[PDB]
Amino acid sequence: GPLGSMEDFVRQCFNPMIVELAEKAMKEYGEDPKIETNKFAAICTHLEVCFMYSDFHFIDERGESIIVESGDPNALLKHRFEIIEGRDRIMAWTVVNSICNTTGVEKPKFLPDLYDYKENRFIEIGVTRREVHIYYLEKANKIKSEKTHIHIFSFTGEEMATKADYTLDEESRARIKTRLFTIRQEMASRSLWDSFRQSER
Ligand SMILES: [Mn+2]
Ligand SMILES: [Mn+2]
Ligand SMILES: [Mn+2]
């Protein structure tokens, strides 16, 4: 089939809010979305996984975790996750600081992606086009925060998480894997997938 542009794919298949955040993210780190297009799509994907990971999860009036997929979560519910990814450098560290000195949890050395108020830990989310175990080890070796929980998703549907603790129910993680499958298939139909996969390096 004809070869599409990654730009077209990103703008057509990701929410504009996600795209704008990815653009702002690449700018902050001196990367050009119009040249590093595979990275651009990977940033969008990762960002969306982080949001989907957090979606629908609340801590109820008793302090127990629950899922509310309707539109109106009653006012007394608290979001289960703090989202750190998708924020500019200053705000992200401000949030991390607001979490740490509060919950007493120690400060990480790299910005994680989320904070889990139920499990009382920071989470690093990974999305890989490679083998989950390799990517997991790379992540672990980079941060070695020990307290930061790592959760990896691959585009083949495999997951790997610290201490075989996957945090979320099967359905939540299934939503994420369905979305990644959709991204991969759509890229493939536009003849963008092979390059995207090989780009991760
Ligand atoms: Mn709310
Ligand atoms: Mn991050
Ligand atoms: Mn991450």
Author numbering: -4 to 196
Q: What did the article's authors report about this structure?
A:
Through X-ray crystallographic fragment screening, 4-bromopyrazole was discovered to be a ‘magic bullet’ that is capable of binding at many of the ligand ‘hot spots’ found in HIV-1 reverse transcriptase (RT). The anomalous signal from 4-bromopyrazole or 4-iodopyrazole was sufficient to determine the structures of three proteins (HIV-1 RT, influenza A endonuclease and proteinase K) by single-wavelength anomalous dispersion (SAD) from single crystals. Here, we report the use of 4-bromopyrazole and 4-iodopyrazole in hot-spot identification and to solve the structures of HIV-1 RT, influenza A endonuclease and proteinase K by SAD phasing from single crystals. 4-Bromopyrazole and 4-iodopyrazole have subsequently been shown to be useful tools for both ligand-binding hot-spot identification and as a source of anomalous signal to enable SAD phasing.
The potential use of 4-bromopyrazole or 4-iodopyrazole for the identification of binding hot spots was further explored by soaking the compounds at 500 mM into protein crystals of RT–rilpivirine, pandemic 2009 influenza N-terminal PA endonuclease and proteinase K from Tritirachium album Limber. X-ray crystal structures provide a time-averaged snapshot of a protein structure, which exists in many conformations, including those that exist for a tiny fraction of the time and that are effectively invisible in the absence of ligands. Ligands that stabilize these fleeting conformations not only allow novel pocket identification by X-ray crystallography but may also inform and enable drug discovery. There is also a 0.9 Å Cα backbone movement of Thr151 and Gly152, further expanding the pocket and allowing the binding of a small ligand. To determine whether the anomalous signal from the soaked compounds was sufficient for SAD phasing, data sets with a reflection-measurement multiplicity of greater than 7.0 were collected for crystals of HIV-1 RT, influenza endonuclease and proteinase K soaked with 100–500 mM compound for 10 min. Experimental phasing and model building were performed with AutoSol using the scaled data sets and the protein sequence. The numbers of anomalous sites were 45 for RT–rilpivirine, 30 for proteinase K and 25 for endonuclease.
